[PDB]
Ligand SMILES: O=C(O)CCNc1cc(N2CCc3ccccc3CC2)nc(-c2ccccn2)n1
Ligand SMILES: [Cl-]
Ligand SMILES: [Mn+2]
């Protein structure tokens with residue numbers, strides 16, 4: 001076993017400084033990948049869905065299940081019969097039970113057009129378009145449940161308008177104690193919290209990622225195309241009683257879809273679009289398409305592009321997990337860097353997270369370990385390079401510290417993550433609102449930060465110690 005990274009002292013010494021370099025500061029910039037090679041012929045563009053057929057509770061705790069779902073060659077896995085094999089009480093998530101539990105709870109309503117089959121037409125039924133319009137409003141569980149039940153009775157006897165109940169927050173364990181406890185029966189690799197889940201080492205709540213979200217659906221309710229925040233895997237269980245239809249594109253094709261968006265004058269990361277399948281076929285993009293029944297679990301693998309529509313009436317619950325794998329960490333870092341270049345907020349603060357991983361996790365896989373320690377090295381050097389430059393300009397550094405569960409801070413202007421050294425205007429320091437800016441956004445306002453002090457959250461000696469103690473663990 002060979003260490004390939006310099007000591008924190010060595011990194012420190014090189015920041016104090018025509019010497020030799022320790023590493024190449026210039027990193028190649030992120031960019032969308034080209035269409036995958038080798039290309040796929042027309043006859044391979046509708047592949048079948050990787051499927052797991054559970055019968056016994058023992059079946060669900062079979063270790064090879066974990067490796068099958070995280071395998072990069074499987075963009076999505078449907079786990080059939082999951083709820084029945086664990087004897088999960090999905091009734092705890094039925095609309096009737098939810099109304100009884102918290103009838104005032106908020107629901108974010110998306111009002112959409114009911115579209116036909118797998119297509120997306122402009123409002124006049126004239127042409128098939130990618131942009132799928134929606135309006136955001138808000139209501140209560142009781143009011144949305146009314147509409148959902150009403151809508152089913154209307155069904156029992158040129159586009160109609162439907163309402164999708166989205167982003168229902170199930171994080172509060174004192175409002176949802178029985179619901180959340182039921183999900184502790186799941187095997188570790190799909191649980192909301194676990195030691196092998198990267199999002200469980202964030203140290204604070206990431207709403208909808210390390211907490212459960214619920215969706216309430218009528219037929220036609222659509223989830224537009226997207227990748228997960230920072231390419232984290234997603235877990236989704238259909239409560240029933242109706243089915244959902246899923247559309248999945250492998251991660252490696254996200255650059256192709258990015259280009260379709262640009263050309264269609266749509267934003268890939270932030271827009272709402274429903275892909276035209278004839279467009280994807282034309283470009284030799286394979287599309288996985290399947291039905292998720294009540295009690296089926298859907299595993300969206302890292303970076304997989306997906307979209308969904310309800311076929312019947314149903315609720316879904318969903319959250320993220322981050323497998324402790326090189327593939328997962330690598331894709332989360334790449335999207336983190338791409339988000340910076342696009343001025344898109346990273347919902348997962350990958351720098352904060354990586355340092356927490358280095359504190360908590362004994363990593364035995366060499367490839368994953370090397371990626372993490374490399375991230376520590378670059379950020380440790382970036383911090384000390386800024387710290388030195390501050391001293392060199394005589395601008396002092398207020399010890400601000402932080403609490404154990406204090407979230408990561410983002411820049412008020414550009415929304416990049418700000419680690420260790422925060423820039424706050426004096427009128428924001430004085431009123432202790434501590435409006436955080438990144439270094440760049442502050443200077444665009446004060447050449448030498450006239451209106452700015454800088455707070456320090458970590459002791460450099462603490463960072464240097466975590467870096468030095470992060471070593472490759474034995475198998
Ligand atoms: O339909 C399902 O069961 C899947 C729900 N998944 C959703 C659902 C969802 N919302 C509901 C669907 C919807 C409908 C219309 C407009 C926008 C949106 C996005 C918000 N957002 C996201 C999201 C957002 C950012 C990053 C990662 N994920 N995921
Ligand atoms: Cl655990
Ligand atoms: Mn999602």
Ligand SMILES: [Zn+2]
Nearest residue numbers: 411414438441
């Ligand atoms: Zn900024």
